Amino acid sequence: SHGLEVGSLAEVKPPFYGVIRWIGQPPGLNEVLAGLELEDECAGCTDGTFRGTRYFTCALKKALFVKLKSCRPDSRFASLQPVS
């Protein structure tokens, strides 16, 4: 959504911020998910696994899986203009 890819800085509007580490469609779902690596550990978060299956690897308790169509480029950085 909006040309998000792995490595993109994303936002899921209290907005959450994470870097997309994985995009795909787990078995059982009919929608594409983004697996986000968040900056800090979070309660309902894994180390890159979703419903038991591993999709990427990150530090303990930093992986959050959401619907890709719920993601937007991280607005904190979207307005950043370059040097001249």
From Swiss-Prot:
Span of domain CAP-Gly: 24-67
Summary of the tissues where the protein is detected: Detected in fetal brain, testis, and skeletal muscle, and at a lower level in adult brain, leukocytes, liver, heart, kidney, spleen, ovary and lung. Isoform 2 is found in all tissues except kidney.
Renumbered residue ranges of the record's region Interaction with IKBKG/NEMO: 4-84
Annotated compartments: Cytoplasm; Cytoplasm, Perinuclear region; Cytoplasm, Cytoskeleton; Cell membrane
PTM summary: Ubiquitinated. Polyubiquitinated in hepatocytes treated with palmitic acid. Ubiquitination is mediated by E3 ligase TRIM47 and leads to proteasomal degradation.
Subunit text: Interacts (via CAP-Gly domain) with IKBKG/NEMO (via proline-rich C-terminal region). Interacts with TRAF2 and TRIP. Interacts with PLK1, DVL1, DVL3, MAVS, TBK1, IKKE and RIGI. Interacts (via CAP-Gly domain) with microtubules. Interacts with HDAC6 and BCL3. Interacts with MAP3K7. Identified in a complex with TRAF6 and SQSTM1. Interacts with OPTN and SQSTM1. Interacts with CEP350. Interacts with RNF31; the interaction is indirect and is mediated via SPATA2.
Homology family: Belongs to the peptidase C19 family.
Associated disorder: Cylindromatosis, familial: A disorder characterized by multiple skin tumors that develop from skin appendages, such as hair follicles and sweat glands. Affected individuals typically develop large numbers of tumors called cylindromas that arise predominantly in hairy parts of the body with approximately 90% on the head and neck. In severely affected individuals, cylindromas may combine into a confluent mass which may ulcerate or become infected (turban tumor syndrome).
Function as written in the Swiss-Prot or TrEMBL entry: Deubiquitinase that specifically cleaves 'Lys-63'- and linear 'Met-1'-linked polyubiquitin chains and is involved in NF-kappa-B activation and TNF-alpha-induced necroptosis. Negatively regulates NF-kappa-B activation by deubiquitinating upstream signaling factors. Contributes to the regulation of cell survival, proliferation and differentiation via its effects on NF-kappa-B activation. Negative regulator of Wnt signaling. Inhibits HDAC6 and thereby promotes acetylation of alpha-tubulin and stabilization of microtubules.
Entry protein name: Ubiquitin carboxyl-terminal hydrolase CYLD
This protein's encoding gene: CYLD
Full-length numbering of the shown residues: 467 to 552 of 956
